[PDB]
């Protein structure tokens, strides 16, 4: 009776690594780096942003340490930000930190996606109901807390798959 | 036990509404006709290709009728365009041709939104399982479908804000 969210949820992260392979196919630094206004966020910050967002998330709700810190990458990454700064809230002068190349964007991508599959696999209905406790008020469940996570990352894939076509 | 599947579904597409809101306050004419380069899409663009999908393939799997057409949304925009058109395919004249004021935009993907509430309060697990296209490879499932509904409008709608930030 679990199969059916199971894999809604499935399919709707496979979705978000299926674009972070359409959008590191072929990404240089110059274009990854490009922001159209000095406010605007750039395809690395949108990749790296959501890769943390879904990281730090469903690193929450399934227990666990987040890829970021357990293998290594925000070391390989070494930007000038906080170690578990995910993005939210950043000024423009914070967006300007996140350089990274295109194959660490997408293998700190595919590691977390690892991780979310890992969870999904043993999603139940009682799980998906399950209380989360964080700091904003109101606390949310799980389920909530996932489509939250999946629509922040398709909106910005989005806007990365958006930015390489108005440069 | 089909609560949270129909519980995932029904949060995500309320996300989507929410993001319609936030997008067509303050959307004057000028906004939301504005291009970021002579080929790129539109936040009125976006807005009403996000809502067309949505309505002609949530009415597909429910085998009813798109509202655009039940309630005469297509007379009251008045675009020059044909009667059935989503926007998939355009070229950038015809992308041009998708004008219309901010309440319209909305009020049409308000009424998708009622539309596809209501075929998600009747989803089952065996509804989510049945297969809508034979010839694709995968066949593609309602499960599937309603998947890619969701993130191609999550992209175009994270689109319209990130446009909307760089105008
Ligand atoms: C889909 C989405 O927007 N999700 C939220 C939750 S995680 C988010 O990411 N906000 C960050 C994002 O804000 C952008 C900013 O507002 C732009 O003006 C707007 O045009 C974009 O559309 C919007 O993305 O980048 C900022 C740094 O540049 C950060 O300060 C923000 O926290
Ligand atoms: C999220 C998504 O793209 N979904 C698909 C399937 S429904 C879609 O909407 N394609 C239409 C879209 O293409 C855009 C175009 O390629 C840009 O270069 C790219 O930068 C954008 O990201 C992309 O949206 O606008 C065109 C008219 O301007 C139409 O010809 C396309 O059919
Ligand atoms: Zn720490
Ligand atoms: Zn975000
Ligand atoms: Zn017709
Ligand atoms: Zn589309």
């Given at each position: 009776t679990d199969a059916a969210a199971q894999e809604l949820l499935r399919d709707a992260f496979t979705r978000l690594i299926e674009h972070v392979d359409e959008l590191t196919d072929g990404l240089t630094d110059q274009l990854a780096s490009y922001r159209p206004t000095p406010s605007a966020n750039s395809i690395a910050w949108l990749l790296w942003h959501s890769a943390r967002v879904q990281d730090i998330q469903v690193a929450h709700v399934?227990?666990?340490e987040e890829v970021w810190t357990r293998d290594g990458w925000?070391?390989?990454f070494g930007l000038?930000?906080?170690r578990?700064?995910?993005g939210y809230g950043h000024r423009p002068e914070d967006v300007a930190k996140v350089r990274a190349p295109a194959d660490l964007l997408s293998g700190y991508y595919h590691a977390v996606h690892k991780l979310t599959?890992?969870?999904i696999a043993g999603m139940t209905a009682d799980e998906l109901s399950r209380v989360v406790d964080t700091s904003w008020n109101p606390?949310?469940?799980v389920s909530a807390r996932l489509v939250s996570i999946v629509d922040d990352?398709?909106?910005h894939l989005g806007q990365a798959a958006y930015l390489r076509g108005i440069a």
């Open positions: 399934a227990g666990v925000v070391d390989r000038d930000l906080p578990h700064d995910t599959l890992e969870y606390p949310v469940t990352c398709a909106q």
